[PDB]
């Protein structure tokens, strides 16, 4: 739960102090952010389906042993590729939620806290989702300020995975 | 602990698809009215002390038992603690209209407060009258315009009346 | 400012003397001064994590406090303070619970005992909202009970949970108090029914073959020539 | 926390005379079968991880809600915590067949677990199905012989089925 | 020490993470603040001497028993009024520092933490400094956005005193 | 509750890990112990009644003021000697339980934890039970491996009493 | 630092009591272990060089994209394969140390505590070392009790990696 | 823990009069260049992981002892801890250029670090070489103008070289 | 905290190759003599209380100041604390001969003990005489053979004399 407003409330709350001018600035600085952020969330919602299909294409082209070698984790048959579409769709949707909230807290809460044990026990190499997020950040084609926000955004995703 | 932005996020996640366009018109107009919202909160905040003493002064004029001996707020630290509680309820309702959601209010302060006031022996209806009078002064302090740009501050007057009402009804 | 309410203590396995002896129900005690090898730091850090966060994952672990404690400038009491004021504890425990249930959980995990009464959690719930979580944890650590039972250099534990010649002594408090309650799982809305009973397929009801039925001899005719 | 040796001790102490001869034949054959018992435990904990993932993979194939959004084990830390719980239940049932008594199992992990899963909102019947499938794989891993002398472990196959059953019925 | 930047650093340190997207907005929102704030600090520096003299005039006109009754705390003689000029000059200077820093932290650190015991032991009624700050917030005459922020800032001063 | 198996379980629980090669080593070392230990428990059960009678004889012969001086603690009359038979029978039975369990935990749990206050408040000099356990460890006559356990065993009893 | 003797000392130190009868058995149970364990450590020292070469052969035959795809982590050129010989030699040597000590503590201290971050940041898929340890546990050909102890041994290695 | 705004505040307070006009031109141009400053920080922390692995991979190519047995970073947790330390030094130098002052860097991480590395037995010159190479890559991530509006950034490259240099010289 | 098995492990790791054959003959004969070692420890801790009182009774016969008024061990809790210290030193030397290494002894109890006894005002030479007499009695519980198999314990009587000597010289 990291949005700038809840962190201002937590600071005032932890401190026990009443709301102040310092907290107030965040709200109209969340204007510099949000005035492009909601636009970028809508255009990502439009771009979404071709983004997951291209990311699945890039992951399969980078690592052919996934589509070749038979296994539960590997996408040899149909149902593995269905799991891949589910996983990359989850990643893109958490990027959209992270973009709308303004902070990494939805993404940090819904993805990052358990990804190390899941990648350890279920044999999911994180470099696959590295490929997927790099293909998304190359393919999304955001313009101006919104695009810059995503890079800081999607790089945080790769840094949590790597 | 929930912003209305992450209210839309968590509801769309429990749904499990992207945020729809109708919610995005609503969130855009939230962004266009959040200006009013945030500093409506701070306008409510500045005289917060005079609001607290005026509401308590009115309450102890209405109920002379609470400053009479044997009353609940009679001795000096109990009276100071009652002022502390009224300041806390005002501060949390201020947080709640800053988040734009009553989730911080119902989540942080109201929930066990009902059982606390019953187990202490504290009257609840007196607190309800206090928060209601405090809310009236709160919007008017935030509603009347003195040296402020004319704006649509009426939207807040609605929601802050809702927040004070939830506070008073959850105290009971 | 305003002091605490005076709440009378209630009877428990802690305020009594007890004639303790070395057994396993006694929690293994982890102390900074005698661990001096690099692995025993790992066991101590794991044990303090098991108490404060209940098996913290790698996301929850704080690199700075563990690093600084392995060097040895940090005291384990200051390490527990840093864990309680760390954001994964605040997020998991202070956010989701109310003030009273938070004080219940925090007294159980710092002091190693259940609070005496509900009025004690009520009396301690003034200070956290008025003075912050930092002042609450600081005032909790400065109390003499935490110091006499654990001290500067001892990871806390549940104290005297189990009496001698008992099968059970008491719930371990890691099982008893989780981070959610009923009130906040209601907000998350989890009991969506599994609904795997009485689906009522509409296909025609099977009827057991009557005596003398042709089918009765179907299974043997399949096995025969 | 009770070994079966000190089960006989505590029962004979509550009786208050010496341990009888019939209990000593029983304890001698316990000593002759505890060989089977102890390392039955360790071959159960040999493939404990693969047992845990296979039981969870079967469970989320049987109940597609728990990986569907809105389900109990949907988000990533809740799914990881569910894997943690299944590992914990397997580890404690492993401790219980090492002690030879279900007292460690009912004493250490099962008792408040019922109330914990009800108060969290966690389904209990899903856990019951998981521990049952996990127990089937557990005996068969121990039961099947790879590089081990043939022997009668029927009691082990027996007692570990009892322990997994007590775990699943006490979760409920 | 409350400025928005040090609170962003404190949040990232307590959470043990690199500065995220939310922190970045913080400083370009400190642009919404600072682009008027430094102007207002300069014009307060110009207004300063007549502000303290008028505030001393207002405090003496509101409470004539200060200039009448002989005492150590009261400004009966010259040296008491010199102490008053010192005290109100300290208040105005902390307002200017609080305006330049962007948050209440200089004012909260240099004034607020000990004011209750000083007003208790030295017999300084805080309603005097209430009069002084109300006269300052009426007399400073800031234009547009700078004035409202200062008014909010001075209300925090009165709320700490009351 | 000190048996080697429950201490292995307690170590694995406190560390949070599963069992190792050590657990197997621990229990097949409990074979080095138990293969004589159950035999010695049976032969102590046979020896038991003459052991308590001889220990009562040795305690009365070492300290004649017990059988002479009238008192509640002293065994002047019949009921005091009945209490003595009860106490030494309890000691011998805890030795047998301690022998069957494999560790001192039954003896340490059922006898040792309160013996200091009982000997303080009820005026039971522990040198009496020193005499009793020394007479038992001289009279039990167990050959080989069993004797070492008893000395290790019965000496722990005397060390807890002294 | 997990050997049975140091854990007995740690238990006695944490309880503050000297070693009991149960503690003594521990070491003569370390006889059931060690009487084969030192033999098995010597025969592993003899088997060692062909074990690492066969494990490198098995890892390269299981995953051909390592020897094909150019990268820093992958063993495309010579120096990558030299790093592989180093890594599997380290694994086999920690198995030998773990076998000589009697507990997992050398292996748990020298390998397990940092393997998750190293596999996360350096892109080393742990299923490679799964293949390597499975090939070692198939190829070592240990006899009787020594072989079983190692198997519990090498399964703990795979369980730490998976 | 000092922002450059409160550096000017604390220096003017130790002086004891108002902030002069020359410091206000300087602070205004600080406000006009802080745009560059803040998100210079975030593009430095964009590739922070790849920067850390590239600097460590170069360091262990330059000094083959540290991955040789007997070296300081040889075993697996010591190597992971060294990666942790290099990440920490990069993160704190990132905080320092976000505050605009080296006070957070010298205050939070560098000061006892010299004594810590001497008392552990850790080489200091190896860390100095690592932070120097890391700083070169750090500005160049920052100095490069691709995919972004191009404006003079000769000030940030300057100050971040100063911050990395203070880090490496204070490690020693 | 070091077993002699992990002494060989840590020395071979700081070397960085496998354990040599000569160390394996030595460790095999360690395994063949550890039988003697472990239960040598327990027969030392058999009469540990009587050893402690006999050494203290001899010490206060040799130095009549320590039970004279004004002496260090004169009052009742100081005398009880001195008995506690002598029991602790015997227990840790018992741990050290159980581990087979003096690392637990020098690591757990001896190191700050020198400074503790100097800062308290406690005499150190009196403790040295006490631990020396205690060690003589300690081996002889072990050294004399009664109703048991004869053996070459000269090596071992050996090591416990070394451990008591390190204790007494490190107290000083
Ligand atoms: C909301 C955040 C979220 C994340 C990150 C997540 C990861 C996740 N991926 C899973 C499976 C999977 N994910 C993949 C996807 C891949 N594996 C590959 O080898 C491909 C390269 C890659 C395709 C890009 C596959 C194949 C499985 C199947 C595992 C199985 O069937 O046992 C599972 C097991 C659940 C199941 O059985 O359906 C989880 C929890 N789940 C989540 O809910
Ligand atoms: C974060 C939300 C939160 C709330 C609301 C809260 C309330 C709270 N109110 C209390 C007392 C009190 N509450 C009152 C209330 C009043 N006096 C009256 O007569 C009226 C009926 C009412 C004023 C509205 C009084 C007099 C006391 C003091 C009773 C006592 O302390 O003995 C106490 C006992 C501690 C103390 O202050 O001595 C708590 C914990 N605590 C919290 O943490
Ligand atoms: C923290 C420093 C700060 C302040 C003080 C601030 C106030 C502020 N109030 C605004 C608007 C406004 N403010 C009001 C307020 C009211 N109108 C009424 O008639 C009511 C009586 C009253 C509420 C009780 C209104 C109606 C608007 C219209 C524009 C909007 O919705 O924001 C805006 C919109 C942008 C602008 O005016 O340039 C600003 C800047 N912004 C800041 O950055
Ligand atoms: C020593 C014995 C012991 C047990 C058993 C135990 C259970 C336990 N399970 C928990 C959560 C959980 N338990 C599950 C369970 C499952 N997921 C499903 O969908 C299935 C119905 C079921 C798998 C069988 C889930 C999803 C959570 C996470 C809920 C949450 O943390 O929000 C929590 C809350 C803390 C957390 O992990 O976040 C505790 C304390 N604790 C103990 O100390
Ligand atoms: C930087 C923040 C700061 C504050 C707030 C502050 C208050 C402060 N005011 C003081 C004195 C004073 N302040 C006043 C001022 C007044 N008293 C009145 O009755 C008038 C109404 C009012 C004039 C507005 C006077 C008269 C004294 C003299 C006390 C004495 O001489 O004993 C003193 C005693 C120090 C001394 O002896 O010079 C302190 C500490 N000092 C500080 O450094
Ligand atoms: C802690 C390290 C350790 C291990 C692992 C260990 C195992 C172990 N299992 C044994 C026997 C055995 N183990 C089994 C086990 C089984 N047979 C089956 O067919 C079943 C499926 C399965 C049980 C589920 C059997 C049947 C024997 C026969 C001998 C006996 O009763 O001990 C023995 C007897 C002595 C020997 O084999 O040399 C050993 C050593 N001993 C040790 O010191
Ligand atoms: C299971 C472990 C256990 C121990 C150790 C134990 C000691 C014990 N011995 C007792 C009494 C006694 N024990 C003795 C025995 C002796 N006193 C002498 O002077 C003789 C030398 C010596 C005979 C060997 C006597 C005479 C009493 C009687 C006290 C009385 O009647 O007030 C009592 C008082 C209980 C009663 O009134 O019957 C306790 C608790 N009880 C236990 O349950
Ligand atoms: C004592 C315990 C211990 C472990 C576990 C360990 C792992 C380890 N393996 C490493 C590298 C490596 N390990 C491998 C080995 C492999 N990668 C593959 O793709 C192959 C499938 C596999 C061969 C089996 C390779 C290729 C590197 C090179 C990384 C690089 O050059 O950047 C490194 C980086 C150190 C260096 O640069 O030399 C560490 C720390 N190091 C240790 O000291
Ligand atoms: C906030 C600032 C801060 C810093 C900087 C810090 C450093 C720090 N580095 C440490 C270890 C270490 N530091 C290194 C360093 C390196 N490896 C090499 O070979 C190179 C010479 C160098 C890489 C630059 C190594 C190998 C260790 C592990 C030594 C050990 O833990 O045994 C430790 C001991 C704890 C541990 O990680 O095991 C601390 C406290 N702690 C702090 O709180
Ligand atoms: C946190 C999300 C976020 C980002 C990323 C962001 C960046 C950002 N960089 C800007 C300007 C700029 N950024 C640069 C940066 C550079 N030019 C060079 O040639 C150098 C190599 C390089 C520095 C090393 C320059 C030169 C400008 C010119 C405008 C200005 O001074 O701000 C501006 C001014 C407003 C605009 O472009 O619309 C934005 C928005 N703003 C945001 O809200
Ligand atoms: C923990 C319970 C326990 C004990 C007590 C124990 C002792 C013990 N000591 C033994 C041998 C022995 N013990 C000694 C000891 C000595 N001889 C001397 O002359 C020296 C003075 C003295 C050493 C200071 C000797 C010489 C042997 C010969 C056999 C051997 O080397 O083990 C043996 C070999 C097997 C047997 O005797 O049946 C046992 C059992 N075993 C156990 O399981």
Residue numbers in the entry:
A (entry chain B4), E (entry chain H4), F (entry chain F4), G (entry chain J4): 1 to 162
B (entry chain C4), D (entry chain G4), H (entry chain I4), I (entry chain K4): 1 to 172
C (entry chain A4): 2 to 226
What does the paper say about this structure?
Phycobilisomes (PBS) are the major light-harvesting machineries for photosynthesis in cyanobacteria and red algae and they have a hierarchical structure of a core and peripheral rods, with both consisting of phycobiliproteins and linker proteins.
For Synechococcus 7002 PBS, we modeled 36 APC αβ monomers in the core, 72 PC αβ monomers in the rods, 6 rod linker proteins (LR), 6 rod-core linker proteins (LRC), and 6 core linker proteins (ApcC, formerly LC) in the map. The central core contains three cylinders arranged as an equilateral triangle: cylinders A and A’ at the bottom and cylinder B on the top. All three cylinders are each composed of two hexamers (four trimers) joined together in a back-to-back fashion. These LRC proteins have three different structural conformations in their CTEs to adopt three local core structures for rod attachment. LCM in the PBS of Synechococcus 7002 contains three REP domains, similar to the LCM protein in red algae. We defined a total of 288 PCB in Synechococcus 7002 PBS with 72 PCB in the core and 216 PCB in the rods.
